[PDB]
Design a protein around this ligand. Structure first.
Ligand SMILES: *[C@@H]1O[C@H](CO)[C@@H](O)[C@H](O)[C@H]1NC(C)=O
Lengths: 49, 49
């Protein structure tokens, strides 16, 4: 959204009140650990392979 | 190379339909809840029934 602000060389804006805000920020940390068996995937119940 | 020959051509399908023609294999009383190497009309493999 536009704001069309103007420049004044002898005027300053100063706040007259304040507020306290609480914000949320979520970050991932870890992931699932997985073990893989080489046989029972490529093979299984098969001694020939 | 000019004497008559008798030719017989046999066509069959394997392991994808109910079967009615098998070879001379003697059957075995089945057991359950144990992993054994089975044979069901030519379908081998080891597993729990
Ligand atoms: C600042 O904001 C609070 C909360 O709305 C209000 O009660 C208070 O009067 C304000 N103070 C001034 C100086 O405007």
């Amino acid at each position: 959204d536009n704001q069309d602000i103007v420049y004044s060389n002898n005027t300053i804006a100063i706040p007259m009140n304040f507020s306290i805000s609480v914000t949320t920020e979520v970050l991932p940390v870890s992931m699932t650990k997985t073990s893989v068996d080489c046989n029972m995937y490529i093979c299984g119940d098969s001694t020939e392979c | 190379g000019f004497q008559p020959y008798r030719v017989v051509v046999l066509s069959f399908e394997l392991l994808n339909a109910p079967a009615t023609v098998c070879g001379p294999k003697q059957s075995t009383e089945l057991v359950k809840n144990k992993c054994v190497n089975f044979n069901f009309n030519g379908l081998t493999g080891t597993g729990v029934l």
